[PDB]
Amino acid sequence: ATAAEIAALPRQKVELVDPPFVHAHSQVAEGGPKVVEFTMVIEEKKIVIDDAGTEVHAMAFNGTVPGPLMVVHQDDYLELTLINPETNTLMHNIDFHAATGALGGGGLTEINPGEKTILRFKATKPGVFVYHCAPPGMVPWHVVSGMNGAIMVLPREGLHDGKGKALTYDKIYYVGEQDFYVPRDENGKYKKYEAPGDAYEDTVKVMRTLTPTHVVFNGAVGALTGDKAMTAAVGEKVLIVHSQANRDTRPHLIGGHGDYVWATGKFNTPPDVDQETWFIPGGAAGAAFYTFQQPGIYAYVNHNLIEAFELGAAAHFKVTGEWNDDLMTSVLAPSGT
Amino acid sequence: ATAAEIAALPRQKVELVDPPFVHAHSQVAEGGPKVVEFTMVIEEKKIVIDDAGTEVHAMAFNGTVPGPLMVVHQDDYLELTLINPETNTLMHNIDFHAATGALGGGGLTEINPGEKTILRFKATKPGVFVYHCAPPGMVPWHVVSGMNGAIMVLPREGLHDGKGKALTYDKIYYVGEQDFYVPRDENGKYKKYEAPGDAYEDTVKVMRTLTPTHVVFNGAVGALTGDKAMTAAVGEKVLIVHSQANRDTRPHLIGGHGDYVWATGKFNTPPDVDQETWFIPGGAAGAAFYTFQQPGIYAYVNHNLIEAFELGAAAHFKVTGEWNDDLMTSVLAPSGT
Amino acid sequence: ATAAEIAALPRQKVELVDPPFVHAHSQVAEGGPKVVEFTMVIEEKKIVIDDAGTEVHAMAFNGTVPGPLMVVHQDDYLELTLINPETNTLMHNIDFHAATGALGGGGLTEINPGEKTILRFKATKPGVFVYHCAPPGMVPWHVVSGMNGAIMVLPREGLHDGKGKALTYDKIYYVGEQDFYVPRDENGKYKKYEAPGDAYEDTVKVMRTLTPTHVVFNGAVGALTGDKAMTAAVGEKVLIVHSQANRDTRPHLIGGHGDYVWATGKFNTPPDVDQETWFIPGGAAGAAFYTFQQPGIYAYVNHNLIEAFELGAAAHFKVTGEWNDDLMTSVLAPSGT
Ligand SMILES: [Cu+2]
Ligand SMILES: [Cu+2]
Ligand SMILES: [Cu+2]
Ligand SMILES: [Cu+2]
Ligand SMILES: [Cu+2]
Ligand SMILES: [Cu+2]
């Protein structure tokens, strides 16, 4: 609370990892409050988002879409050093939905190419929160170009269920969902531009339709399927953090459920249970806990099946272990009528 | 647990009924776990969804859109014999969101025309869940062709409110909301086809716009009105189950309320109370308990009034009873200004 | 119960104020149950919804979009004298979501131009509820023309958190969010019509797209900005009631949080806490309680950033007070890299 106390707190640098993987942390806080330091360089680059070679001039924190997940405990201070290289052509900033004041920090971190800034904030509330770039006048554009992520502020004493009973996960994954608005020419072919700003006008026209051309996980159609599927084993407890900085989503683990789901993302708000499909509004993050019971492949999707299977909002989970015939059994395999 | 133990469980064959009605069942489980058997034949047929003669090539479970509601209690086993007659042209399967393993069953139930299969799963979680067809690579198409429904896994001891008091209903209705995407020719007239597959290409383009041409209850505009209006009486406690396998909905009982609403559809997640309009994400089912206090006709709708009154999402309830002037009264009937 | 017992109740006529302000009231009920009287005259008037001059023929209760907020206590009787002037061309009625019977009151208040009516209903359920016009056959047209508002039925003992601790706000604002569907000409310019009737056909075509041309607060793009910006101070407890009679919204106070959010708008439903972005389904109202901690400008928006910053759903908050460096601080201001 006092100047003396804050300045005396321990400083601790963390090495970030690209989604859907998460950096090192302890569910239960180790030691007292500390100033957790992170650093992210902003990269403006063209990325291919589908099998048709469709490009997007990405604006990515730490070079990834979405930005990496930052994990701190309640009442710690998140001190982030944001850098916008001279090679970039736009001004960026950052808004932490977890922070209080200055529009989430957006007003204190507006950096042009060739600048860096250091913002500190006390994570006073526990939950998963979205963070995103918000330069005044072109907020949506930056956000829908991939410039968003989320952070997890864990209660000092780890997660718990509705009746105070502790919930300890074995694995944690971060799925950032992105709605893209790529322009098409009169023939229907997606367009490519030299610089980010060149697409500005055409993109906004697409944005106003409120109909994304692609809705993806980890920046691309299929980014989390195939060999890039997330893993687990029967018996394993998994926390799947999910975010959507600009548009609603309805997550669903096909084959499983969300045993405990902090749908609003706030840990002080009791988790719903036995969820089939949960809902996360635009501009929020949510977290679902589940203990795998059956092996095989699972499909984790946005349950608007058109957005999942036509637009690209589908990921996989490869689970190992033994099958349970009490849970499910093929009494009579598909056979002649 | 052991196959031996399950084999010794009493089995019961249940007779399914067309929505909005629900087959006979007991709120409080009568006895120990049983293996509840059901049989549904898949019927591919043309359905007329509006008074303009618009046709949809439905892929209907048990012949109706939505498929019938199956009722079992927690920890019972639901055994379904799914049949895909040789009269059909497509492979179909079934995913129960209430089940655990093999993508909810779809992976163990892929039956081509002229095949059948039998699936058994333990209803481990109490609540209303969605079920739907989901052929690999043709998922949304089958779902938006009306191939979906719901099941209700009641708690053994029946329904209860957040504080444990028993909530016993007098009537139950199942309302399945469907979002259709019907192609139109260059003149804005809805197109008709001679075969399901002939409309595939045309339908996928409409689906991608994420804008349904129709949003209807029980398969057609006006389906649940007039001869198909739901009934009740002042003093009657009614449970309205609602499902939407592909798209969000916001149910509303015009003139009444949602006394208790399990918005997520999961009974272990306490119900919201005194609701005016509840929300159900695409891919889930919710349930609302309400005791009618006033006679007259009510209108149950998706409260995006455009969807409800332009697109077709509206149903009626004809309630009998005595008017309660304490609740509402016309002090001055419409008259001179 | 009896008309004699209701007539023996004290009556109090209330003078309404234009949104975002609310007429005077007490959080805790002043004594016992009373019949609270209100009067509103319907005005069909042209309004301008943006800086380019886009006009809409609105259907406004009390001449405002949204209609004013009426405030009463649970078990009070709300007696509304609704007047439809001779200068109006259409018939109108009102559906109170807080009421029980005759389609929320709509069936008993159908008045033509030149008529008036007086409806009384008991405010039996505590919470915020929208009210809107619903002429049979033209329900959505009236609503998306601005003919909706909201009411608040406070618990007779004022607000409390989910654990019983009292929640008393210092100020209260009412944000009515409106989705408009404005036709455009062949050049993309918004169209103007002589009579509201002349706008119907073209407007219906846009409504069916389910993509509004404007999403605004208090009737217009930027209505709640500049000298019309809401105000507060550090330490000030603010209750923000938000409604959307026809379309979903997801409120977010950029730079702040929703400390206690009755997202379903029903006070008997415990509030969520520490919310970053909440959700209010079309056809409902919600309420958020927040104690300001930092000074400066805040943007209160619907967090689908395209809706917020392209469609018009952004309001501002001007907050006085001392900056809190503990909560947030610029360790290094934007500077050389
Ligand atoms: Cu940026
Ligand atoms: Cu934001
Ligand atoms: Cu099928
Ligand atoms: Cu599914
Ligand atoms: Cu009207
Ligand atoms: Cu309504």
- What percent of the residues of chain A sit in helical stretches (DSSP H or I)? under 10%
Rg over CA atoms of chain A: 21 Å
Order of helices and strands of chain A: HEEEEEEEEHEEEEHEEEEEEEEHEE
- The strand order across the widest sheet of chain A is 13-12-15-19-17-18
CATH class of the largest domain in chain A: Mainly Beta
Write down the domain tally of chain A: 2
Tell the overall outline of chain A: flat
Number of helices of chain A: 4
Quantity of strands of chain A, as a count: 22
Largest interface: A-B, 47 and 69 residues
CATH architecture of the largest domain in chain A: Sandwich
What is the oligomeric state here? homotrimer
- Provide the structure class of chain A: mainly beta
* CATH fold annotation of the largest domain in chain A: Immunoglobulin-like
Strand content of chain A: 35-45%
